[PDB]
Amino acid sequence: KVYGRCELAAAMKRLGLDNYRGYSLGNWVCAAKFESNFNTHATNRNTDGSTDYGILQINSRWWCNDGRTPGSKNLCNIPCSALLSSDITASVNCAKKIASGGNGMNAWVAWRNRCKGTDVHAWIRGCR
């Protein structure tokens, strides 16, 4: 499914991402925008042989197991396929785990590059 900006913001808010680990909601919406363009089915093969999955592009070498990545740590303890549904719950739960790390949102390259230090409130401006 391809979410609309406000719809994703509402969903993220219900799942408790607003101010999670000190990051206001707009950060998570921004991240989703640049990581997958709000597409729950986005998949991106990495050079190192890993693949990023879903709305928050979670990596098969460290976070979920896809059954084809040499040395998967599967720290979220979930199959990567669970990250491809229209329901963003599994992706949010794993993202919570990743951002609980000392580096927070820095784990997402797109966030680091396009969202960090910007007016993240613009991502939820005009929403319900």
Q: Could you give the strand order of the β-sheet that contains 43-45, starting from the edge strand earlier in sequence?
A: 43-45, 51-53, 58-59
Q: Which residue segments constitute the domains of the chain, with CATH numbers given?
A: 1-128 (1.10.530.10)
Provide the experimental method for this PDB entry: X-ray
To one decimal place, what's the resolution in Å? 1.6
Q: Which of 7, 18, 48, 52 is catalytic?
A: 52
Smallest Cα–Cα separation from 46: which of 31, 32, 30, 66?
A: 66
Tokens coding 93: 């739960």
Cα–Cα dist 64/112, whole Å: 21
Cα–Cα dist 82/94, whole Å: 11
Which helix or strand (DSSP H or E) is residue 51 part of?
A: strand 51-53
Q: What is the DSSP letter of 125?
A: T
Cα–Cα dist 104/81, whole Å: 24
7 is a catalytic site residue: no
Is the distance from CB of 28 to CB of 120 less than 8 angstroms?
no
Cα–Cα dist 13/28, whole Å: 10
Q: Which of 7, 35, 48, 66 is catalytic?
A: 35
